[PDB]
């Protein structure tokens, strides 16, 4: 299924995922396409932060859902 990821630049990329994909799997696919390592990714869907160990199915994510990527930056 094709979802969207709104990236750090505000631009949107497409991502091909499976409902059984773990959030870890999704972060890895984002690195494959955008180059951001998984430990620098925070993914927000419908205002909620996606957690490792869960799957896309745990979150009602579907074709054309948008995940918001925010970078983990050190500070404060």
């Amino acid at each position: 299924m094709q979802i969207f990821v709104k990236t750090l630049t505000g631009k949107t990329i497409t991502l091909e995922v499976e409902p059984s994909d773990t959030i870890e799997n999704v972060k890895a696919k984002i690195q494959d396409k955008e180059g951001i390592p998984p430990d620098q990714q925070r993914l927000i869907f419908a205002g909620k932060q996606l957690e490792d160990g869960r799957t896309l199915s745990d979150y009602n994510i579907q074709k054309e859902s948008t995940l918001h990527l925010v970078l983990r930056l050190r500070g404060g």
Binding site: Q2, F4, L8, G10, K11, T12, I13, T14, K33, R42, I44, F45, A46, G47, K48, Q49, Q62, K63, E64, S65, T66, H68, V70, L71, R72, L73, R74, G75, G76
Partner: protein
């Protein structure tokens, strides 16, 4: 002298005190927090109880309020914890924690009622007659700052259409992959609007993480009706500035304070950990726009990174009085007993 009490600075906790005051003065949230059924909570491991305790002391203590039991309930007991998260993440996780605790209570759904809006992502193919919409909830809005004069220009940018092409063509069903355009439209805006200003970011150029200290203007009164797909004649999306969360510093680190006018009446105070003082509107608003005028003479690096607005039609409810009658006696008795010390 303000009648509002500060929070102690008993270890580097960065943005935390700023956020705690911001949420404490979201009176309807504070009231719901007091109603959470924490009778049986662990007195140390419970984030809901720890927030009840901090709020109770902010409302009743005349001395600066400690937060060690709150950070223990978080499991964020060193600066590294705060270095590895940001205020948006702290806010979202805190609100999600107390939202879950409110499920199955007289106050279930308070967090979405206060903070949740609805938007729609719409896709239109460029060369085939195919379009699709997706509605999604949101609880805050991330606003691009770089190159934008003000909040208005950031909202225009937020809803600007983007092309989907190249390696990002849209899956248009029977039409296969298609060039398309994609945009966001707002369906609703919530009673309490959290705007995250994107001052801290990765910069591919210098290939590092930076803070943008550029000038970015935000108004006392913010009209957003023009960004809605459909407006409500009896409830315009007119927003009133409530809180300005401020950072002074650079790429190395800095100091965090928050400005609030708690009652929504334009009477502002500055909250700097244990020191709460009255300030002017200009000191809370214009002075936190940032900018670089006469940077040759001195660093200008003090500016807002998060704003809270409250919808005008909702102000008297969001900022309703919170009285001791609102606070369940079970909570009062448990906290008074804790000072067994």
């Amino acid at each position: 002298h303000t009648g509002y009490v500060g929070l102690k600075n008993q270890g580097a906790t960065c943005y935390m005190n700023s956020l705690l005051q911001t949420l404490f003065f979201t009176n309807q949230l504070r009231k719901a927090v007091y109603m959470m059924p924490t009778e049986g909570d662990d007195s140390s491991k419970s984030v809901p109880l720890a927030l009840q305790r901090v709020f109770y002391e902010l409302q009743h203590s005349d001395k600066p309020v400690g937060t060690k039991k709150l950070t223990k309930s978080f499991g964020w007991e060193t600066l590294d914890s705060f270095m590895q998260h940001d205020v948006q993440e702290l806010c979202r996780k805190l609100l999600d924690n107390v939202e879950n605790k409110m499920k199955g209570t007289c106050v279930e759904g308070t967090i979405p009622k206060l903070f949740r809006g609805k938007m729609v992502s719409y896709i239109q193919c460029k060369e085939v007659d195919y379009r699709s919409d997706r509605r999604e909830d949101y609880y805050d809005i991330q606003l691009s700052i770089k190159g934008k004069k003000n909040i208005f220009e950031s909202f225009v940018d937020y809803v600007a259409v983007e092309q989907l092409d190249g390696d990002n063509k849209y899956d248009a069903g029977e039409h296969g992959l298609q060039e398309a355009e994609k945009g966001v439209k707002f369906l609703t805006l919530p009673p309490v609007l959290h705007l995250q200003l994107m001052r801290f970011m990765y910069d591919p150029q210098t290939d590092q993480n930076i803070k943008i200290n550029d000038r970015f203007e935000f108004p006392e009164q913010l009209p957003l009706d023009e960004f809605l797909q459909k407006t409500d004649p009896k409830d315009p999306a007119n927003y009133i500035l409530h809180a300005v969360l401020v950072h002074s510093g650079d790429n190395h680190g800095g100091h965090y304070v928050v400005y609030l006018n708690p009652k929504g009446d334009g009477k502002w105070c500055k909250f700097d950990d244990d020191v709460v003082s009255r300030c002017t509107k200009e000191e809370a608003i214009e002075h936190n726009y940032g900018g670089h005028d006469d940077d040759l003479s001195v660093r200008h690096c003090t500016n807002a990174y998060m704003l809270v607005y409250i919808r005008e039609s909702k102000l008297s409810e969001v900022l309703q009085a919170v009285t001791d009658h609102d606070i369940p006696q079970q909570l009062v008795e448990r906290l008074q007993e804790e000072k067994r010390i």
